[PDB]
Design a protein around this ligand. Structure first.
Ligand SMILES: O=C(O)CNC(=O)C(=O)O
Ligand SMILES: [Mg+2]
Ligand code: NI
Ligand SMILES: [Zn+2]
Length: 331
């Protein structure tokens, strides 16, 4: 078995190896990368996502989210308060303000210590989930707006033709902006490219150990657990590395820097935070190996997680028993 200790693997494809996305994913899995839940891909030195970022300030963040925390430093939830629209130029200036900027620090480890010590006492503003792409249309390799669609994968593997589309999303972050513990919708893959700015630290639980994270989460968030059988789908819960270590949960951590890709694998729980002003682009995708994870994915039926038009069809085809009760949550 390759990668038996489920370590995060880092890949350095050549420009020749960067031509065939699907084949490269299958390569990485042949080396055991999926066992970690997360992998890093450093693009060939010749590759670029676009020529410059000089003209992005006029993108609109229509609903910036203020991430308000409750709990204790190592075990907290966050609620997203909607703010007034602002441009990316306005958001960058805010991120750089004395109130919101990254503190002085020695290295990524000291900054990580400061994040876990101090996150709950601040409410950073996250520009999340903005439909769009920053890849130049002439970028042919690993262009997250040109990937094969999940609906076409389901058709190729299973023969069934379904409605829905699959498009990327932009994330504009600042110091302390946080992504809660989650797997992807329908336990899909994700791919995430850090276009610019400061790093993003990731934490991940190997897929084979995901249920250990879930059991700890039910103990740490007991009222949420009683309310919903898949409450991590709400994407509000945070648990620190120290707490995970105290409870014996297997995990790994890695920091992504600008110019690098991360891939999350089916049923790889992940969480993390941004070090400062940055912009990431991410999209879900599928492979043949995903299908069985999609059939088994948990779902929120309390109604809080409230998810996409395209997820309807996935549920309808892969989980026809759940269909009914799940669309009651989504209607
Ligand atoms: O970058 C972020 O805030 C969150 N991204 C993801 O969870 C992802 O790419 O799967
Ligand atoms: Mg612009
Ligand atoms: Ni994710
Ligand atoms: Zn729910």
């Amino acid at each position: 078995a390759q990668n038996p200790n489920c370590n995060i693997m880092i890949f350095h494809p050549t420009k020749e190896e960067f031509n065939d996305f699907d084949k490269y994913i299958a390569y990485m899995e042949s080396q055991g990368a999926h066992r970690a839940g997360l992998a890093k891909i450093i693009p060939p030195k010749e590759w670029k996502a676009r020529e410059t970022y000089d003209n992005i300030s006029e993108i609109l963040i229509a609903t910036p989210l203020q991430q308000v925390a409750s709990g204790r430093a190592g075990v907290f939830t966050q609620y997203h308060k909607k703010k007034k629209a602002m441009t990316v130029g306005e958001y960058r200036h805010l991120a750089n303000s004395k109130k919101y900027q990254t503190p002085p620090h020695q290295n990524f480890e000291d900054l990580e210590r400061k994040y876990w010590k101090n996150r709950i006492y601040n409410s950073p503003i996250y520009g999340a989930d903005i439909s769009g792409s920053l890849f130049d249309e002439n970028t042919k390799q690993w262009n997250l707006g040109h990937l094969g669609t999940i609906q076409d994968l389901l058709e190729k593997e299973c023969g069934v033709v379904i409605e829905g589309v699959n498009t990327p999303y932009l994330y504009f972050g600042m110091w302390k902006t946080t992504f809660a513990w989650h797997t992807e919708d329908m336990d899909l893959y994700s791919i995430n490219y850090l276009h610019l700015g400061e790093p993003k630290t990731w934490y991940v639980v190997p897929p084979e150990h995901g249920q250990r994270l879930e059991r700890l989460a039910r103990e740490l968030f007991p009222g949420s657990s009683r309310g919903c059988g898949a409450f991590l789908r709400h994407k509000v819960a945070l648990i620190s590395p120290t707490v995970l270590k105290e409870n014996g949960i297997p995990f790994n951590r890695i920091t992504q820097e600008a110019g690098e890709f991360m891939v999350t694998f089916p049923y790889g729980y992940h969480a993390g935070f941004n070090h400062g002003f940055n912009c990431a682009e991410a999209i879900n995708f599928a492979t043949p190996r995903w299908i069985d994870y999609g059939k088994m994915a948990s779902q929120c039926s309390c109604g809080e997680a409230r998810v996409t038009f395209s997820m309807d069809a996935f549920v309808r085809i892969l989980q026809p028993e759940r269909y009914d009760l799940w669309k009651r949550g989504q209607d």
